[PDB]
Amino acid sequence: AFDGTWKVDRNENYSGAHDNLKLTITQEGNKFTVKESSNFRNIDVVFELGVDFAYSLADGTELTGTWTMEGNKLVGKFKRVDNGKELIAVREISGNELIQTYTYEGVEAKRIFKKE
> Which residue from 85, 70, 81, 77 is spatially nearest to 101, judged by alpha carbons?
77
Residues at the binding site for tetradecanoate are 67, 91
Burial class (CB in 10 A: 0-12, 13-18, 19+), 96: exposed
CA distances from 61 to 6, 49, 52, 87, 88 (A): 25, 20, 16, 10, 13
User: What are the binding residues for hexadecanoate?
Assistant: 67, 91
- Collapsing DSSP to helix, strand or coil, 16 comes out as coil
Q: How far apart are CA 102 and CA 97, in angstroms?
A: 16
- Can you say which residues are annotated as belonging to the binding site? 67, 91
